[PDB]
Design a protein around this ligand. Sequence first.
Ligand SMILES: [Mn+2]
Ligand SMILES: [Mn+2]
Lengths: 297, 203
Amino acid sequence: LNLDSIIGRLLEVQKNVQLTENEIRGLCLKSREIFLSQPILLELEAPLKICGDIHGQYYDLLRLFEYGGFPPESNYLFLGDYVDRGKQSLETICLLLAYKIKYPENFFLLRGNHECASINRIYGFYDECKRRYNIKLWKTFTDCFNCLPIAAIVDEKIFCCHGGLSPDLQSMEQIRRIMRPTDVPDQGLLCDLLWSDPDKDVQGWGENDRGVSFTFGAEVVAKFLHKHDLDLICRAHQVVEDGYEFFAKRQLVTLFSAPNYCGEFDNAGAMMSVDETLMCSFQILKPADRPITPPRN
Amino acid sequence: MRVKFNPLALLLDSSLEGEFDLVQRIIYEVDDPSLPNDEGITALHNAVCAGHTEIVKFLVQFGVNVNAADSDGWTPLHCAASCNNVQVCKFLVESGAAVFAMTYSDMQTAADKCEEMEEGYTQCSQFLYGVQEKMGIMNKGVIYALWDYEPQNDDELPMKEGDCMTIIHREDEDEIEWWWARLNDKEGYVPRNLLGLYPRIKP
Ligand SMILES: [Mn+2]
Ligand SMILES: [Mn+2]
């Protein structure tokens, strides 16, 4: 398994990239062991860039790295949803897994609700695997997705996860004790961490139109940060018009990194840069596609 | 060690959200409060679009660029007009707004942006069109340059920003967009889209 060769062929579209089935298998197998050798609740330090959903928009992932600096020039934390919907989920996850193997201490992937064999069975990734390779490769990705970490804390101040808060989340130790490999359950802590949404019109825990997990209001955010001495929740999971959106007086931020999501929205993508002093700023991926005096009459 | 957001990002968001208390603090930590985001939107744009009048005043009294244009050429006056917000429209005009500033894709002024089917349309459009009509006639024809201008023709007045001039002759001498003005002891054409009813507030 030659990672420089693999990354080179993936970066050459800077259009499909033809990696071999065994190369892709090796990416899943080596990254899986690294995921299991690190905690399921990551403890990270700034500086780092944090990115939201990509959903197989491979050319936008390259734009993210051009803007933010290709690994290892910058440290990265991705918050999940790498596959499904977009046309190039395979290139997207293969490059992220390749970077994870190259720089396992400077490159980090969180599990999103689409890193799940029940969800990506129907939303595109299963079809992409079957079309370009076979079903057995899709099952290898599942074994690897089942070992992804699910949350991260940056300098004990920024709680990061794909979805959001959970009624079942009383202490960070309940995250740490979730054993891997695991599927995404229908309900409970792991499910909520990958599936829940904030909502300005909800007091407490509301219903979630996805049919999964809950919505949570601004007071839940404030209570969670106060109890755990956190300053910020950083999550993804929802397309937002400007690529990033504040909630609950900037105690929560939603990050979304796929511009013109699904080709249906005109949204921008954003990533958040956290520097060594925890000063946070946003880099925007614009959708890829005196004043002048009058003339004399 | 605490989480903090980029002060410019705080100025834009607090101006959009109506957190006037934060606007007053964070503005002294931004290098240029007129600096826009990645689409040309400034703090004044957000305050005007969201209707936070006290913030609109504060930013304008602070000396921000009352005529900052976005990617489409939208000025704060274009924004106020599209909200049919005649009161903000009048305060901007009294604060140096380029009345005849035009957007790029359509060549429309703020008056053209008033929304036909929303409330406040009659008063807001009649104010702005009325200002376009009586500009250089009312107030003894007194007008103010909002930008510098080195002349491109011999019959054009040089303008410094803030110059106070009198419109001797407008829109009736084969020039609909240039006006014959007097600046001190000289007369000459001036371009209408760089002029205001009142001068800017100095930063
Ligand atoms: Mn998603
Ligand atoms: Mn999601």
